[PDB]
Design a binder for this molecule. Structure first.
Ligand SMILES: Cc1cc2nc3c(=O)[nH]c(=O)nc-3n(C[C@H](O)[C@H](O)[C@H](O)COP(=O)(O)OP(=O)(O)OC[C@H]3O[C@@H](n4cnc5c(N)ncnc54)[C@H](O)[C@@H]3O)c2cc1C
Ligand SMILES: Cc1cc2nc3c(=O)[nH]c(=O)nc-3n(C[C@H](O)[C@H](O)[C@H](O)COP(=O)(O)OP(=O)(O)OC[C@H]3O[C@@H](n4cnc5c(N)ncnc54)[C@H](O)[C@@H]3O)c2cc1C
Ligand SMILES: Cc1cc2nc3c(=O)[nH]c(=O)nc-3n(C[C@H](O)[C@H](O)[C@H](O)COP(=O)(O)OP(=O)(O)OC[C@H]3O[C@@H](n4cnc5c(N)ncnc54)[C@H](O)[C@@H]3O)c2cc1C
Ligand SMILES: Cc1cc2nc3c(=O)[nH]c(=O)nc-3n(C[C@H](O)[C@H](O)[C@H](O)COP(=O)(O)OP(=O)(O)OC[C@H]3O[C@@H](n4cnc5c(N)ncnc54)[C@H](O)[C@@H]3O)c2cc1C
Lengths: 380, 380, 380, 380
C-alpha cells in the first residue's frame, strides 16, 4: 500500500495479512470488472458471498456470532482496499457491518443476535439502514417523520437514498412514537422498496426509496436497547470510521494513476511529471494521504481501547473524504481529455466520492460537530 | 438573465434581443430534452438547422458570406444562453463559428470563402477542427506529428478528441511539412473518423478520433493565408472568447437551481437558505458571476474595436471556466443526495465543465500564457 | 496605472487627470516617507492641507460647499492612488469625505452644512465617525450602548477604534434615545479621546477611543435628517466604494514590486519570474486586479446615476479587499526573507489590508449582506 | 497540550515531564514579557543560561558532551512550548541545537566536539549558522559565492539573514573551494556582523549580515567529515524537525485565544462562538492542529529509530508551518479590530510565522522536494 510515513510499521502481522489478502482478492475479482459494473450501474451480488468468505462482513464482531473478531485497524484496512477499487463495493460492507450487523449486536436481543448475525456474517442475508428521509438527512431527528405506534407495532413513513434497499431482507428502520429501531423484514406486507434511477454517482451500488405503509412488526423485532437518536448515530460513527479509511484507499488509486500518467506523457520537452504545477498537485495528494492514514490509524487504536469519541470520528471522516474528493478532481485535471472517460478511474472515483462527501454526515455537519465540541455551543 | 451589476444597461437593443430570443428557442426546444440526450450520450443534430435559422452560426461574420453580422457581445450572448442549457450545445456553435467558419474567413481563398461559409452558416454542412493529437494538446506545435508533403498534398497523422468528428463533411486539419491548414473533406479516401466512447463529460456532443492515412488534398483546399502556429491559435482565441461567455451561463443555471433548492428545503428548523454556510456558497457564486460578466463584456467591446489580445482572452477563459466549475461542484454539494442524479442539472454541468476546463487551453496553460505575458519569460 | 483590460478607456479626460495629478503629488510628497511614518506610527498631518488643495476632501460634493464636484469614478481614482501608497492615507480621506462630509451633506441642517462642509473640505477642520463600540462593531445597532437624552442632549457612551479620534474637532457620534446622529465638538466638556497604541496595522493613521461622559450638545448640533440605522449605514456604503477602489491600488503596489523582484533575483539558473510556481502567483494578482477595477468602475457609474445599491457596494468591498490582502500575502511570500522588512512595502500593505479587511464591515458581514439579499432571509 | 486525539498517550513519562516543565518555566519567565521584547525588537539573552539549565540546548545529544540525551519527541516538545510563546525563542534553540551543536557532533573532530559542545550545551558560548547568501537561499549550492582557499584557509564571501549573527562567538560558515564547513570564531580579524533592522517579523531574535573579508581559519577549525551540500542540509533537516513541532505550539496559542475571544464577545444576540462562520474557522484550526501533532509525532519516532528521511521532514515542515500561518491569519480575522494590536499575540504569531514559512526551505522548495521524490524528476 501507499505509505510515506511507514505507518505499516505500526500494524500487527495480523493486520497486514488481511490487507495483503484483501488486495489480492479484489485485484483478482473485482478490479477487472469495476468499469463495466459502474457503467451499467449494477452492484455485483456474486461478490457478497466472497466478501463473506473472506470475513469482510462484520470483521470486528465476535466469532461467536460468526464474526472474524479482528481489530478495527483490520476493518479499516479492508475498507481501504475495497474503496481503492470502488466506493460502492466499500459501501456494501460498511452498511452490512456498521449499519446492520453493528446495531443488532449492540442493541439487539440475544434472540435477534443469534438469529441474524450469523446469516449476515455469511452474506446469506443482506440488510439496509433506513434513517434518512426526504426532508433531509442532516437533521436526523427533526426530519424523522416515520411513525411507530404500539404487542406489535405499526410503522408508517418513508426513507430516501437507502443503500441495499432492494437487496435486503432486513431493513433497520428508525421511527418515532422518542427514537426506536426496528428489524423490519422487507417482505412483510405494506413495505415497498423502489430503486433510485439516473444516478451519476455510486452506480456500482443499489440505492432505494423505502415506503412503509401500515407495516406490522412484532415487539420481538424491535431493538430492545435501541433508545434515542444516539442509537442510530452510534451506527454512523462506526460506519464513518471505515469510511475515513476507505477514502485513503481511493486516494492511493487516483494518485498512483496520476503520477504514472504524468510520467508517461510529455510536453514542451520534458515529461508532464517534470512540470512544477503538476508536481505540486501530486505533492499535495501525497501529503494528504499521509495525513489521512495517521488519522485513520490513530482512530483505529483509540477505537479498540474504547476511548474513541464521535467528534474524533467526525474529524477523520470530514478531512479524509474532503481530501480524497479534492485529489480525485486534481487527478482528472491532470489526465486532461483522457480523464473524462471511464478508461481511467479518476473520474469514477471523483463522482463516487461526491456521494461519500455527502452521506454519513455532510462536510458541513461534521464541521458543526467539531464546532459544537470546541465551543460547547450548538450552531446547527 | 442573471445580472447583479446591471450590465444589460450596457448592451445595445439588438444584443439584448438576441439574448431574449435565444433563451425562448432553447427553452422550449432544447432544455426539455437535454437530460435524456446527455444521458443517452447523443447530440441533437436536428437542432443544427434551428441554430442556423436563429443565426447562431458564425454570428459575427458578414452577411455577404451568409453571416448575421452582429456584434461580438451578441455572439458571447448566444454562447451564454447555449451553455446555460448544456456546454455540448455551445461547443457545436463554438466549433462551427470560431474553429471552422473563422479559419475559412481569415485564412481562406475567396473561392473557399464563397464555397463553404454560406453552407456552414446555414448549418447545411458541418465542420470540425483538428489540432490536438495523442501526445498532448497543451503543446500543439510540439506534438503535431501529422505531416503534409506536396499540386496536391498527402496528409498522414492522427487527431484526438475532435468535436463534430463524425458529423463533419469538412475537417480543418493542421499538419506540418511549418504549420499549415487544410480544408479536408471527410469522405476523401484515407480519412477515418471514429467516435470516442465511455464519455462521462460533454455527452451531448460528438467527439471523435481522426485518422488520416495518405489523404490527398489539392492545393486549392489548403488555407492560403494560414501560416504558422499563430493561425490555429487565433482560432482558439476566437473560440475562447465565446467560452468565457458561456461559462457564465452554466453558472447562472447551477446558481439559480441552488438558491431555489436552498429556499425550499429545511433542517433544524429554518430553511437551508438561512444557514450561514450555504449563504456563503451562494454569495461566492453570485460574486463570481458578476466578475465573469464584466470580463466577458469588456473583452467583447475590445474585440469589436480591434484591441483584443490573446493574453486578455486567456485571462477570461481561465477565470470564468474555473469559477463555473467550482460553482457547479458547490451546487452539487448544496443539493446533497439529490445532486447525484440527472434530475438536477448541477452534476451534468459539473461534469461538462470538467471538459471546458480542459480543452481550448487548460487552466495551467493559460496561467503560463499570463505568466509569460507578465514576465516576458517562457515557462511552458 | 496598472490596467490590463484598458479600463482607462472608459474614463473621462477629467477623471483621468485627477488620477495623473494624484499620483504625481503622492509620489513626490508621500511615498518617499511612508516607510518612516508607518514605522514610527505617525500620521502626516501636514499632508491634510495638501489633500485639501488637490481636492481630495469631499471630491464629489458640490462646489457651493467647498467641494470639487467631480465624479464618483474620480473619487474612486484618488482613493486608488492614495491606497497605492498606504491605506492610512486613504483612510483619512474616506473618513473626511464619506463618514464626515457625507452625513453632514445628506442629513445636515443648512446651518450645519454651510458651516462645516467648506472648512472640512479645505482641510481646515478634520472630522471623525464614531459608530463602533467595545461590544462588537458588526452589530452596529445591537451593540450601540451610547445614550442620548433630551433643547440640549446629554450623551454618554464609548466608541472604540475611531479613526482621526485625536485629530478631530468634530465627532459624528451615533447614539440611541432609535438611532440619532450628532456632531459633537471634541472640546465640549465630558468628551475624551485617547489614542490606541501597540498597533501592528494601519500605523500611519490615528485611532482613538472616545469616552463621552455627560457630554452636552445643542439640538442645533444634531443631524436633523439622520434617522435610523440606515443613515450611518449609507455613510459606510459611500466609504466602501472608494475602499473597493483603493484596494486595487495597493494590489498594483505589491504586484509591481514582486514582478520586479522576481525578474531581478534568481535560482537554479533561471530567474524567479520564469518558474511556474512564481508565474502562477503573479497571474493571480493580475487576474484579481482586472476583476476589481471592473467592479469598482461599474459601481462608480451606477453611483452617479443613482442606481447603486448597498448590497452592490458590499460585493466589491468584500471581493477587492480579500484579493488585495491575499495578493499582499502572496507577494510577501514571493519576496522571501527580504519581505519581512519594511524595506519592501509588501508587508506594510499586508498588515494595513488586514484592517480594511476588518473595518467598514468584515468579510463575513458582507457575505451575510449578500446572503440576505439573495435569499431574503436574515442569517446574521 | 491542546490534544484532541490524545497523542500525549503516545508519550513516555520522561517526554511528558519535559513538556510540563518547559511550559511552567517559559510561562513564568517568558510569556509575561514577550509582548514587550517583540515590541522593542530585542532577544532576551538572559534566558539563554536558563534554557541551558533546563536542557533546551542540544537536548538529544549525549550527556558525554554536555547533552541531556533525551528523545527527539522531547526536543520536539520543547520546541512546541517555546514557539507557543514566540517563534524567536524557539529559533534560538533550533540554531544552537540543530544548526550549531549538531554539525559539530556529526561532522566535527573529537577535538572540536570536546572543545565546543559542552560550552554550547551550557549556553556559555552561542553559535550561528551561515548558509544563506544575498542571491537566494533556495539555491544554496548555486548561490554560495563564499570562497575558502588553502594550513590556514582564507574565507571571503557574504552571508545574509543569519540568526544569532550578532550574539555569536563561533559561526558555522559553509563555503566552496566543493562545499566545506568551518568553525569561524567571530572575533577573528576580517569578519563582521551588523544587524538587520526594520524587521516586522521575528523581532524577538537577532538577525545579522555576515561579512567575511580575508578571514583566516586553521584546518583544525574546519569540520573534517563535513563534505558537500549534504552536510549543511542534514543540519536543516534536524532544524526543520523541531520547527514542525513548534508550529503546532504557536497554533495552540492563537487557537486558544481565538475561542476564548469568540466565547466572550457577542453580536446579533448570540455569542460570536455560536456563528457558523466563526465555528468553521475554529474547526479548521483544531483539525489542522490534530493533523500536525500526528505528523510531528510519527517523525519523532522514525527519527530515533534511524528511519527518518529528509523528504519526510520536508512534508511536516511545509504542512505544519503553512497551517499555523493560515490559522494565525484566521485568528486575527476573528479578533477584528482587537487583533491589530500587540495586546493579542495573534498578530505577533502571524508575523513571526511569515518568517518560519520562509526560512529552512520555503513552502515551494519543500513542494519541489516532495515533487522530486514522487516523480524522480528535478523541477527546481
Ligand atoms: C448514494 C447515497 C447513498 C445513501 N445511503 C444512505 C443509507 O444507506 N442510509 C441512510 O440513512 N442515508 C443514506 N443516504 C442519505 C445521506 O446520508 C443524505 O444524502 C445526507 O444526509 C444528506 O442529506 P440530504 O440529501 O437530505 O440533504 P440536506 O440534509 O438537505 O443537505 C443539503 C445541503 O445543506 C447543508 N446543511 C444541511 N443542514 C445544515 C445546517 N444545519 N447548517 C448548515 N448547512 C446545512 C448540507 O451540508 C448539504 O450541504 C444516502 C445518500 C446517497 C447520495
Ligand atoms: C470533450 C473534448 C473535446 C475536445 N475537442 C477538441 C477539438 O474539437 N479540437 C481540438 O483540437 N482539440 C479538442 N480537444 C482537445 C483538448 O484541447 C485537449 O484535451 C487539451 O489540450 C488537453 O490536452 P491533453 O488531453 O492532450 O493533455 P495534456 O496536454 O497531456 O495535459 C495534461 C495535464 O498536464 C498539464 N500540462 C500540460 N503541459 C504543461 C506544462 N507545460 N506545464 C505545466 N503543466 C502542463 C495540463 O495542464 C493538464 O493538466 C477536446 C478535448 C475534450 C476532452
Ligand atoms: C484601524 C481600525 C480603524 C477603525 N476605524 C473606525 C471608524 O473610524 N469608525 C467606526 O465606526 N469604526 C471603526 N473601526 C471599527 C471596525 O469597523 C471594527 O473593527 C469592525 O466592525 C469589526 O468589529 P469588532 O472589532 O467589534 O469585532 P466583532 O464585530 O466582535 O467581530 C469579530 C469576529 O466575528 C465575526 N462576526 C461578527 N458578527 C458575526 C455574525 N453575525 N455572523 C458571523 N460572524 C460574525 C466578524 O466577522 C469578525 O470575524 C476601526 C477598526 C480598526 C481595526
Ligand atoms: C528571520 C530570518 C532568519 C533567517 N535565519 C537564517 C539562518 O540562521 N541561517 C541561514 O542559512 N539562513 C537564514 N535565513 C535565510 C532563509 O533561509 C531564506 O530567507 C530563505 O532561503 C528564502 O530565500 P531568499 O530570502 O534568498 O529568497 P529566494 O530564495 O530568492 O526566494 C524568493 C521567492 O522564490 C521562490 N523560489 C526560489 N527558488 C524557486 C524555484 N526553484 N522554483 C520556484 N520558486 C522558487 C521561493 O519559494 C520564494 O517564494 C533567515 C531568513 C529570515 C527571514
Amino acid at each position: 500500500m501507499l505509505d510515506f510515513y511507514a505507518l505499516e510499521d505500526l500494524l500487527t502481522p495480523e493486520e497486514k495479512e488481511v490487507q495483503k489478502a484483501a488486495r489480492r482478492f479484489l485485484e483478482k475479482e473485482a478490479l477487472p470488472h469495476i468499469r463495466d459494473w459502474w457503467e451499467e450501474g449494477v452492484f455485483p451480488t456474486h461478490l457478497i458471498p466472497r466478501f463473506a468468505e473472506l470475513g469482510f462482513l462484520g470483521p470486528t464482531l465476535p466469532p461467536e456470532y460468526g464474526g472474524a473478531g479482528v481489530s478495527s485497524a483490520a476493518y479499516g484496512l479492508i475498507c481501504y482496499e475495497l474503496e481503492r477499487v470502488d466506493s460502492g463495493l466499500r459501501s456494501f460492507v460498511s452498511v452490512q457491518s456498521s449499519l446492520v450487523m453493528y446495531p443488532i449486536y449492540a442493541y439487539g436481543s440475544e434472540e435477534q443476535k443469534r438469529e441474524f448475525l450469523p446469516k449476515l456474517a455469511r452474506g446469506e442475508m443482506v440488510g439496509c439502514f433506513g434513517l434518512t428521509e426526504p426532508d433531509g438527512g442532516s437533521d436526523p431527528y427533526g426530519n424523522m417523520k416515520t411513525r411507530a405506534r404500539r404487542d406489535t407495532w405499526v410503522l408508517n413513513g418513508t426513507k430516501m437514498w437507502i443503500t441495499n434497499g432492494n437487496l435486503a431482507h432486513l431493513a433497520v428502520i428508525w421511527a418515532k412514537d422518542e427514537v426506536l429501531g426496528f428489524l423490519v423484514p422487507t417482505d412483510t406486507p405494506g413495505f415497498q422498496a423502489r430503486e433510485v434511477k439516473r444516478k451519476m454517482s455510486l452506480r456500482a451500488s443499489v440505492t432505494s426509496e423505502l415506503v412503509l405503509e401500515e407495516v406490522r412488526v412484532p415487539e420481538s423485532l424491535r431493538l430492545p436497547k435501541a433508545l434515542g437518536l444516539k442509537a442510530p448515530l452510534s451506527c454512523l460513527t462506526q460506519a464513518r470510521f471505515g469510511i475515513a479509511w476507505g477514502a485513503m484507499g481511493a486516494l492511493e488509486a487516483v494518485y498512483e494513476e496520476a503520477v504514472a500518467f504524468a510520467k508517461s506523457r510529455s510536453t514542451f520537452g520534458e515529461p508532464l511529471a517534470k512540470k512544477q504545477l503538476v508536481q505540486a498537485k501530486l505533492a499535495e495528494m501525497l501529503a494528504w494521504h499521509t495525513e489521512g492514514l495517521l488519522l485513520a490509524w490513530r482512530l483505529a487504536r483509540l477505537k479498540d481501547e474504547g476511548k474513541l469519541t464521535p467528534a474524533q470520528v467526525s474529524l477523520a471522516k470530514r478531512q479524509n473524504v474532503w481530501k480524497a474528493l479534492q485529489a480525485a478532481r486534481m487527478a482528472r485535471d491532470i489526465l486532461g481529455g483522457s480523464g473524462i472517460t471511464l478508461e481511467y478511474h479518476a473520474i469514477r472515483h471523483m463522482l463516487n466520492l461526491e456521494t461519500v462527501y455527502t452521506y454519513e454526515g455532510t462536510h458541513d455537519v461534521h464541521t458543526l460537530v467539531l464546532g459544537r465540541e470546541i465551543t460547547g455551543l450548538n450552531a446547527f
